[PDB]
Amino acid sequence: HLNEKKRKIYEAKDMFDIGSESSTLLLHDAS
Amino acid sequence: ALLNIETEFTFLRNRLYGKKLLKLNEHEEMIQNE
């Protein structure tokens, strides 16, 4: 269960990184 | 402007990743620590 939670957390962190990059790109375009 | 917000969102994501990773490792040690 802890292994699964850690892998879900790694996935969530990568997805948040992708979201941060996308938000940065949208902010740059809005500039 | 865009680079600063990019770095800020990157810092937020890295903080979330690091905190969740440290919490997971703590729970794991505790499993081995009962």
Side-chain angles (χ1 to χ4, degrees), chain A residues 1-12 19 30, chain B residues 1 18-19 21-34:
Chain A
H1 188 85
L2 179 141
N3 181 20
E4 291 151 69
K5 291 221 162 152
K6 188 172 180 181
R7 302 316 317 192
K8 303 208 163 173
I9 283 322
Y10 178 83
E11 302 199 30
Chain B
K19 201 40 90 194
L21 195 165
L22 192 54
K23 200 44 162 281
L24 265 283
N25 288 151
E26 191 217 329
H27 281 306
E28 194 152 356
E29 308 143 4
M30 297 162 68
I31 280 171
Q32 307 326 312
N33 281 28
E34 296 70 69

